[PDB]
């Protein structure tokens, strides 16, 4: 907690996520495995998410 009221909150997770693969070129296949996260219970009128740094440097 910074004096101005800014909070930093980090946690360590192991995430297992669905990566729907299309195995037509197997085993010469490339895939794009997604990782989608957002707010349960809060719509875009209440909670929005943004990347902390430039999007290309935020993961």
């Amino acid at each position: 907690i910074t004096e101005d009221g800014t909070l930093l909150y980090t946690m360590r997770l192991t995430v297992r996520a669905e990566c729907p693969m299309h195995l037509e070129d197997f085993p010469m296949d490339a895939h794009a495995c997604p990782l989608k996260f957002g707010s349960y219970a809060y719509t875009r009128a209440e909670v929005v998410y943004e990347w902390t740094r430039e999007p290309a440097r935020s993961v």
Partner: antibody, heavy 117, light 106 residues
Framework: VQLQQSGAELVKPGASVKLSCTAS????????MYWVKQRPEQGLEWIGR????????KYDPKFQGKATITTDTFSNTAYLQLSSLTSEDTAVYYC???????????WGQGTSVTVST | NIVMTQSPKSMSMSVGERVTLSCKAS??????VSWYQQKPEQSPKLLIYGASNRYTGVPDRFTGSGSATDFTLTIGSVQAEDLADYHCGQSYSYPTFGAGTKLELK
């Protein structure tokens, strides 16, 4: 919400300049700050940005060394300082803040830097 | 560096007709593409942020459309107060802007 830039400046070639941008309506700590130059009838060129929360700054490679950006949390101002400038950078300079989707939602009015003798 | 190519460089047109401005991205820039309007001797004004998100105060006739590397700004019922430079800028990486499109009345 309101960015107030310094006035226009005439500068001798080879000298130094210090442009200012006073933010009203928000804390500069809460966003990133951007300096953007624009030559007459030409595209926008990005100079660099600063994070007032930490002071971490990034510069366009062609402005590395030549430009430096600093902040002042107390006065809510961002400063662009041009160490050694030739006649080529006789362009307007814009102060902008980061917006919703990393867009630049609020720009300053622009400080006209003209250089001659 | 992500270079953004803006087409056409300049285009003249008449009032009240659909005009579309295209921007091309060198690399992937997901939807962090913005469209700015610059009237003469005025600072740029954000029109579209993200891909297809009108900024507050932008008339509903300004429509943004996007992709991974291809974006367009479409003006619908054009008016006479739309004569301005239009710049596209990416924000996926450190920001870069295109040359711009100088709208003309004809």
């Amino acid at each position: 919400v309101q960015l107030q830039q310094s006035g226009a400046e005439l500068v001798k070639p080879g000298a130094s300049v210090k442009l200012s941008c006073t933010a009203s309506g928000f804390n500069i700590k809460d966003t990133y700050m951007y300096w953007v130059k624009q030559r007459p009838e030409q595209g926008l060129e990005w100079i660099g940005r600063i994070d007032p929360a930490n002071g971490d700054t990034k510069y366009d490679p062609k402005f590395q060394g030549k430009a430096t950006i600093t902040t002042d949390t107390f006065s809510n101002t961002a400063y662009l300082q041009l160490s050694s400038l030739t006649s080529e950078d006789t362009a307007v300079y814009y102060c902008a803040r980061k917006g919703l989707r990393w867009a630049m939602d609020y720009w300053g009015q622009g400080t006209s830097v003209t250089v001659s003798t | 560096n992500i270079v953004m190519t803006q087409s056409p460089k300049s285009m003249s047109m008449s009032v009240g007709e659909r005009v579309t401005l295209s921007c091309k991205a060198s690399e992937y820039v997901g939807t962090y593409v913005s469209w700015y309007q610059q009237k003469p001797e005025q600072s740029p004004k954000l029109l579209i942020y993200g891909a297809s998100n009108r900024y507050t105060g932008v008339p509903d006739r300004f429509t943004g459309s996007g992709s991974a590397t291809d974006f367009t700004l479409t003006i619908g019922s054009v008016q006479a107060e739309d004569l301005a430079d239009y710049h596209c800028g990416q924000s996926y990486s450190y920001p870069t802007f295109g040359a711009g499109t100088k709208l003309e009345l004809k």
